Amino acid sequence: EDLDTDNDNIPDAYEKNGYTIKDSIAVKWNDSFAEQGYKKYVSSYLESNTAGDPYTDYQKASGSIDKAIKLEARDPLVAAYPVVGVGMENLIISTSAYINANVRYYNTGTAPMYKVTPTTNLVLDGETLATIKAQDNQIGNNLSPNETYPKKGLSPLALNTMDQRLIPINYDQLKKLDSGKQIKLETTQVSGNYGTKNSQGQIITEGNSWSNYISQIDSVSASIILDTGSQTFERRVAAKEQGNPEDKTPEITIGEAIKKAFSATKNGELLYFNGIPIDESCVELIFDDNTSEIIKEQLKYLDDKKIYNVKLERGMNILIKVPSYFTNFDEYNNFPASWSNIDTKNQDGLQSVANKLSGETKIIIPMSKLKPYKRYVFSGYSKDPSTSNSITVNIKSKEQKTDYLVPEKDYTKFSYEFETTGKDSSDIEITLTSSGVIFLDNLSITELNS
Amino acid sequence: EDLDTDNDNIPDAYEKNGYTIKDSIAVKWNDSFAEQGYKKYVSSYLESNTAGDPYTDYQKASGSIDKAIKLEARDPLVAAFPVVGVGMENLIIATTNSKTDANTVGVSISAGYQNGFTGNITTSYSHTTDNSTAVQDSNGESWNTGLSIINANVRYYNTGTAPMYKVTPTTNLVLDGETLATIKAQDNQIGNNLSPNETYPKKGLSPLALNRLIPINYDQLKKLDSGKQIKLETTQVSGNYGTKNSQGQIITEGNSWSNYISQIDSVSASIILDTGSQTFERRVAAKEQGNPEDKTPEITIGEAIKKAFSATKNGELLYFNGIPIDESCVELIFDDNTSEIIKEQLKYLDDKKIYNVKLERGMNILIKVPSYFTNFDEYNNFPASWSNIDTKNQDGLQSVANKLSGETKIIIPMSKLKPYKRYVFSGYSKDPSTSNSITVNIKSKEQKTDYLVPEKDYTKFSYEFETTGKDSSDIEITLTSSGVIFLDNLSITELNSTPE
Amino acid sequence: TQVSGNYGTKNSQGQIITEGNSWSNYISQIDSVSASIILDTGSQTFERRVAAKEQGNPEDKTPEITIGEAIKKAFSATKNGELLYFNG
Amino acid sequence: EDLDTDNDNIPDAYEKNGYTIKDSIAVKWNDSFAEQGYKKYVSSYLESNTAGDPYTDYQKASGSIDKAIKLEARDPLVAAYPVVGVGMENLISRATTNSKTDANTVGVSISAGYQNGFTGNITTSYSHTTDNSTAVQDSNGESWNTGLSINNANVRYYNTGTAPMYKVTPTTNLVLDGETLATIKAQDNQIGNNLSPNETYPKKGLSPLALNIPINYDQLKKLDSGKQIKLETTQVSGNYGTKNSQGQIITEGNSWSNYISQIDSVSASIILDTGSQTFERRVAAKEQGNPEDKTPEITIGEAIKKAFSATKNGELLYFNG
Ligand SMILES: [Ca+2]
Ligand SMILES: [Ca+2]
Ligand SMILES: [Ca+2]
Ligand SMILES: [Ca+2]
Ligand SMILES: [Ca+2]
Ligand SMILES: [Ca+2]
Ligand SMILES: [Ca+2]
Ligand SMILES: [Ca+2]
């Protein structure tokens, strides 16, 4: 009962049903360990590195790795994949001419990246001027998770050397630069190292590279992203191959994976990221085209009919954006202007109460606290047992929108995309009309890409 | 009891309840060893390197490491961390620098303090890595005179705990909001030796020259003429440490420091102590919040300061080489997230003292010792002697207080204080009746006065007064009391500098 | 002022290696345990070094020899009883 | 009586009371070994290297180390330490001589009477032997400005330590008595292959080593009025000799920068000047706080005689007569 096929210092039976690390020796999981704060881990018994990252399944679970890797990446299923991107602050051209920049390396993965050597392009409209690689002057020694180089409170670093100064080929670039065209900065690849403890016990990060592992880590994991409006966290969760009978990676629900990748606690049934709810009813999801067809196909054959109860797959991409303005009519309403014709004396809501609307809903949102030239999408829950009332929308924007909606028997989410342009433009108006008595809950406002 | 889960030549039983090293082996700690000078160590029995530094628990306790590492790094909880920075001392188209200017500048101090939290609040905490320049060349004239419309002399200074061989900084010189350039020391300004609390070149040697043409905008020079707020920021430094090998000869070639930086900052609480002359930086280990497998010991902030700086406890006061750094005698500058952590834990306490709260991960504590202080008991380094003080009292917070009924005067020459530096007034008052009134008046560049009322218990007050110039009127402090009022720990603290 | 070169040591594999070797390591050591002797023949010059014991050293066992014997040793000059001839 | 805690081939009992090396083994010291020229050695029984220098207690006591090291460093308490520098010779068109104690005794206050017991002085600008200040001898009275009236360096590296330095690459700056000019480094052809104790590169009898900068008109006046130029040293990077199992002395990779902050922090500097040649010795000592520390505690008089190898005839110290 102690066979170890893959030789990762964890028995096959424990690795299949769930195991927890106590006294640095893995033992069978017991439900009585929940109150002490122990976590449950389940992984594959046919492979040493479940997610593909350098660290094994006994090193990740026990925490016997680099201590800068976030405590969420101690879960074997979640790859310790670091994401690094370069962000521009100031771009100036001076005499063709010399070009300088002010950039800071943003890390949002889960593990540090020593000796960062980013590679960037200088493109303005399709045409790329040159490829820039970080020389000795701009290599960041340490880049901890969720931290920048230079760290917060230090000025950005310059960038003026391109090969063994920056210079265009001719004046054809500057003539269209003055016409109103600017130069963007985009990253193509970032190079780095990963820390490991050598034979004698010290850490060495010379012969180890992260770029020997990226191709593998991407291909065996499902990408998940969470955006808080200001901070982005990119996580990768291992997923099993479909037709392979010898691929024994555990299958988990998408709802389960969110709790694991972002280490978000669960207060019984709701999920809080760090005080921000991330339950499916109070947050907007974005999927690519490939995910949409798969997620719809799985839902129709399952009775509950919620996203957060669908088994994860290998290669699906998920983008989660928290609402900018959200009200639940129970404990939170961040809208600067109060809503009209609201009645909280109800018990038919999704969680506690619903809004019994008698007539129409009128809300005037100021543009002062909103982003100009940005695309906004509103969402909400509508329930009508009568199924005999027609509801239309009249919202002022760059182009006035007028759409009709027929509420269903039960609660249903409606999403309508509109665009707002110009800071010194007409104030945005929103109108909701109901034929009879309707139930509304969980209204959302979320920014989209421009 | 010789079980070894981590295999670091320290049994689990010793490593939990207290162990000391005798004859290069670890033995059970006994309370009778205290007077002989042996120290009590407690560590984690599941980790080889409790503090995260490259030297394990047994190596740190026994001292079998580089002999330049300070004796207060031999505690397994304290960590070796060379906190190197670059300070500039020459402007080329004279300079006195401070390592705690950007950290004590962000604090705004009110008249009173909330009951329980006898500390200050700042939202701009910064380490001693950075530099702040207040050029002494200015005497009323700006730099624009004479010349109007590249290479500077700098000195690498270490304030950490362990030496850094092969110094190779990477600093940025600010140009208002914009920058100058990313300058990386390349071949012939690489200090091969940087001893802790020592510079490169040596203390008595002139600074070396930074390397070959740069542009400087003239519009920001007028800003410099408006105020010399130019500060030098060191983004990163590269170097090595030294661990003996099988043969014995110290190797420093592959052993970079930069491998254990993102690990030390992620397992340790940042604590800084300033004495006015030089500043020390330490990073004590702290356990994780919700990890049951984290066996890092729990020690309160009072023990953290004693361990980090090897402070000695006389009576109930921590003494740091003559200068007392007890909680009631020093001005603390916490970070906001650090401060609110203490605030919530204070109301669950009984004694209600800062130094008795438990240490946590991620704290940022900047201890700033006041320039002039007197406890009325034994220490009084004031440039003059205060008038109308009755030392013979028994209601003092530590030993004695003063029986004040009337007015108190003090003479303070401008010479004995640094010009153009903001200062914060501090002290403790108490009155059993709480019916008398306290009136104060501050003689400075502006005429400022205020009124105060005591309470049953000792209360802390804080007042601000700035200094201007070298030739100016002497600063006078007047304390007037209606009835009987008791005073203790009368202090003057040196805060950030004032704009030109 | 100085010269840098190599010397050869027959290793375990039977070859002669002059890559991990240098004379600079031994110039200071040879100079400190030996007595300099020069022979000048008008057109050619010779320079040797003969080891000798330290003055006040109890654990030094370098043999004691005379100047005449050392010149005989350092140049391999034959001695026909008492007269000493180098190359005639 | 055979226990060895530090494992340096010296039994702990012999190491704390006195020992000496006969036939490459340690023997208990006795009073009868004095007249035979033997010395008495005492070191710390918890540390392989008491002084901090690369050579252990057994290698120094038995002499199984470099033969170009002074006998002074064979005592376990005395650290082998190559304190070197740069000696200015030519100012370019005028030569100079260099004083190793000018910059130290300049800050000494001298009075008439003295307090009881104490018979020394006080210095406010203490500096080491690497801190070299010159004194121009060819300046007969004419100013340096004379000759042009319009508004290189020949040097010689010097050693005053106890152990030879191979691959000497000194680093200095042109401080020009008030402000540095250039942090010059000697890279490829100015490197000294070997630098023996109490010897210079080049050796005696060879032309000065040349090393290859603007000078303002203001420095010309001040240099012409009671001021002198000095070339302080910030650091010098060298190597040292280590034996092998194959028997070769390997001096590549081994550095005199790894042990410098170890030797320096555990040793008490003692300096002696005879007026013509200067010496610097480091002597190991013990910190008061640590009880586990076992470095022996001896007087200055014992430290003087064990550092400069004087002779104790009667009760007075004789150094080279
Ligand atoms: Ca297994
Ligand atoms: Ca496995
Ligand atoms: Ca509800
Ligand atoms: Ca242990
Ligand atoms: Ca341990
Ligand atoms: Ca008192
Ligand atoms: Ca021994
Ligand atoms: Ca020893």
Q: What is the residue whose two structure tokens read 């200074």?
A: B157
d(CA D183, CA B267): 40
Structure tokens given for A113: 């990246």
Query: What is the b/e burial string over A200-231, where b = at least 16 CB atoms within 10 angstroms of the residue's CB?
Result: eebbbbeebebeebbeebeebbbbbbbbeeee
> Rounded to whole angstroms, how far apart are CA atoms C22 and C16?
14
Q: B276 and B96 in contact (C-beta within 8 Å)? A: no
3-state SS class at B495: strand
Residue B10 — φ and ψ, nearest 5°? -135, 115
Documented resolution in Å: 3.7
Q: Which residues of B178-189 are buried (b: 16+ CB within 10 A; e: fewer)?
A: bbbbbbbbeeeb
Expt. technique: cryo-EM
Residue B203: DSSP 8-state = T
Give chain D positions within 8 Å (CB) of B186: none
Of the candidates B183, B255, B263, which has its C-beta nearest A68's C-beta?
B263
Q: How many residues does chain C have?
A: 88
Contact A363, A430 (CB under 8 A): yes
SS3 assignment for A55-111? CCHHHHHHCCCCCCCCHHHHCCCECCCCCEEEEEEEEEEECCCEEEEEEEEEECCCC
Torsion of Cα atoms, B105 then B108 then B112 then B118, to 10°: -50
Q: Which residues of C touch D166 (CB under 8 A)?
A: 24-25, 28
- For an interface test with C, the pick among D25, D60, D193 (most C C-beta atoms closer than 10 Å) comes out as D193
* Contact predicate B207/B90, CB 8 Å: yes
Q: Is B263 annotated as a binding residue?
A: no
DSSP sequence for D293-320: -------HHHHHHHHH--EEETTEEES-
User: Can you say which residues of D are annotated as belonging to the binding site for Ca(2+)?
Assistant: 4, 6, 8, 10, 12, 15, 44, 47, 57
D50 vs D59: CA distance, rounded Å: 12
Residue whose tokens read 């580089």? B66
The distance between the two most distant Cα atoms of chain B, rounded to a whole number of Å, is 79
CA C34 to chain D, closest CA, distance in angstroms equals 11
Closest CA in chain D for residue C34? D67
Rounded CA-CA distance B30/A418 in Å is: 75
DSSP element (H, E) containing A123 = strand A119-125
- Measured between alpha carbons, how far is D60 from A177 in angstroms, rounded to an integer? 73
CA-to-CA distance for C85 and B22, rounded, in angstroms?
70
Q: Please enumerate in sequence order all residues whose Cβ is within 8 A of that of A401, keeping only pairs 6 or more positions apart, or say none.
A: A393, A394, A395, A416, A418
DSSP, collapsed to helix, strand or coil, labels residue B365 as strand
- Calpha distance A8→A23 (Å, rounded): 17
Could you tell me if B241 and A203 are in contact, meaning their C-beta atoms sit under 8 angstroms apart? Answer: no
CB D155 within 8 A of CB D209: yes
Q: Using CA atoms, how far apart are residues B92 and A162, in angstroms rounded to an integer? A: 28
Residue D265 contacts B where some CB pair is shorter than 8 Å: yes
What is the dihedral angle through the alpha carbons of C56, C60, C64, C69, rounded to the nearest 10 degrees?
-120
CA B229 – CA A144 distance, rounded (Å): 30
Q: CB–CB of B261 and A142 under 8 A?
A: yes
Rounded-to-integer distance, Cα D70 and Cα D81, Å? 11
CA nearest neighbour of D130 among D103, D166, D94, D92: D103
- Say whether residue D235 is in contact with chain B using an 8 A CB cutoff: yes
Cα B295 to chain centroid, rounded: 28
Strand bridging mode D316-318 / D94-99: unpaired
**Contact of chains D and C by CB distance (3 or more pairs under 8 angstroms):** yes
Are chains B and C in contact at 3+ CB pairs closer than 8 Å? no
SS3 assignment for B330-347: CEEEEEHHHHHHHHHHHC
Peptide bond into B76 cis (omega under 30): no
Name D207's Cβ contacts closer than 8 Å, sequence gap at least 6. Answer: none
| Cα–Cα distances in angstroms (integers) from residue A59 to residues A66, A73, A142, A238, D150, in the given order | 10, 11, 22, 17, 74
Task: Provide the token pair at D34.
Answer: 């004095």
- Of the CA atoms within 13 Å of residue D305, those in its CB half-sphere come to 14
Q: How far is it, in rounded angstroms, from Cα A6 to Cα A10?
A: 9
B chain contacts of residue A136, beta-carbon cutoff 8 Å:
184
* Cα A443 from Cα D176, distance rounded (Å): 75
d(CA B82, CA A255): 45
**Closest-CA residue to D312 (of D40, D113, D115):** D40
Distance CA(B442)–CA(B464), nearest Å, equals: 9
Q: In this structure, how many other beta carbons lie within 10 angstroms of the beta carbon of residue B142?
A: 14
Quote the tokens at residue B378: 């034994």
**Cα–Cα dist D78/D61, whole Å:** 11
Is B431 annotated as belonging to a binding site? Answer: no
- Which two structure tokens, joined as six digits, stand for D119? 């018979």
Q: Are D213 and D180 in contact (CB under 8 A)?
A: no
Q: Letter for the amino acid at A112?
A: P
- Radius of gyration for chain A, computed over Cα atoms and rounded to the nearest angstrom: 26
Q: What angle do CA C22, C25, C29 make, to 5 degrees?
A: 140
Q: Where do we find the tokens 């008109």?
A: D217
- Residue D12 CA to ligand 8 center (angstroms) comes to 8
What tokens appear for C74 in the block? 């350092």
Mapped onto helix, strand or coil, the DSSP state of residue B57 is: helix
How far is it, in rounded angstroms, from Cα B191 to Cα B168? 7
Q: How far is the C-alpha of D307 from the C-alpha of A59, rounded, in Å? A: 54
Determine, for residues D179 and B90 on separate chains, whether the beta-carbon distance falls below 8 Å: yes
CA distance B69 to B84: 15
Q: Are D208 and D90 in contact (CB under 8 A)?
A: yes
Name the residues around ion ligand 6, CB cutoff 5 A. B 375-377, 396, 398, 488
Select from B21, B206, B248 the Cβ nearest to the Cβ of D48.
B248
Cα(A328)–Cα(B79) distance, integer angstroms: 48
D159: left (phi over 0), alpha (psi -120 to 50) or beta: beta
CA A112/CA B40 separation, integer angstroms: 35
List, as own/partner pairs, every contact residues A396-401 make where C-beta atoms lie below 8 angstroms and the sequence separation is at least 24, other chains included: A396/A426, A396/A427, A396/A428, A396/A429, A396/A430, A397/A428, A398/A422, A398/A425
Residues A64 and B317: beta-carbon distance below 8 Å: no
